[PDB]
Amino acid sequence: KGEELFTGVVPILVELDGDVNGHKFSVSGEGEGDATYGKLTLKFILTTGKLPVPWPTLVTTLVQCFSRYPDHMKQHDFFKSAMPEGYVQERTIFFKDDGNYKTRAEVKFEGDTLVNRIELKGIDFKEDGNILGHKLEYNYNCHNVYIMADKQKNGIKVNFKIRHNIEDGSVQLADHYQQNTPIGDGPVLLPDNHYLSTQSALSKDPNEKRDHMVLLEFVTAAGIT
Structure with missing residues (x-):
């Protein structure tokens, strides 16, 4: 079972290739x-x-x-x-x-x-x-x-709204539509309706001179008694 792989501290690697209006960038x-x-x-x-x-x-x-x-x-x-x-x-x-x-x-x-x-x-x-x-x-x-x-798609559909704070005190809405599908052909858990309560804190490494983001997040599933 997949959940056995998460009982301890797991190293994470993230790689992003981006193109926004033709502006190309990479993040690790x-x-x-x-x-x-x-x-x-x-x-x-x-x-x-x-x-x-x-x-x-x-x-x-x-x-x-x-x-x-x-x-x-x-x-x-x-x-x-x-x-x-x-x-x-x-x-x-x-x-x-x-x-x-x-x-x-x-x-x-x-x-x-x-x-x-x-x-x-x-x-x-x-x-x-x-x-x-x-x-x-x-x-x-x-x-x-x-x-x-x-x-029907052997996966989940996920939706939420992010409200980004604008420097003038207003809000930039970002409406998210998301699908997740397994890569393998084995059984997966298809859930009842629930949500993830997602806390995120952004900061900077004072010793880092490259453009960067430090992120601390806490996420808990909820909405089923």
């Missing part, structure tokens, strides 16, 4: 996950290109197998059930009054390392909008992530 991330506590600690580094979008817009794209599932909800944990062969995670993210991201990622083990490999494509962004104009605060709010089974 390293850290570790402790699903028993719902805890993620990651540092992301810009590796190539000028970062054309605010770091907060990339948090959801940059490993929901690290969520803490209560014992009474263990039969609802699709994400760990797909391991080690992994799952494909696809999203469309609609930035209100702006462009969209489309993402496709594969999340799987490579030995002891949990790897998230992502392609991100952004189109129809406004030159002087909040995204390409870099008008978003470097912070992050708590959100609920809503999960339902997609039995």
Whole structure:
């Protein structure tokens, strides 16, 4: 069973290749996950290109197998059930009054390392909008992530709204539509409706001179008694 792979601290590797309105960039991330506590600690580094979008817009794209599932909800944990062969995670993210991201990622083990490999494509962004104009605060709010089974597709459908804080005190909405599908042909857990309570804190490494993001996250599954 996939959940056995998560009982301890697991090293994480993240690789993202991005293209937003033709602005090409790559990001790498390293850290570790402790699903028993719902805890993620990651540092992301810009590796190539000028970062054309605010770091907060990339948090959801940059490993929901690290969520803490209560014992009474263990039969609802699709994400760990797909391991080690992994799952494909696809999203469309609609930035209100702006462009969209489309993402496709594969999340799987490579030995002891949990790897998230992502392609991100952004189109129809406004030159002087909040995204390409870099008008978003470097912070992050708590959100609920809503999960339902997609039995006909042997996976899950996920939806949620991210509210990014604009520097003028307003809000940039980012509406997320997400699908996850197993990579392997073995059984997975198809859940009853529930959500993930997702806390994220963004910070900087004072000794890091590359453009980067340090992220601390706590995620707990809920909504079934």
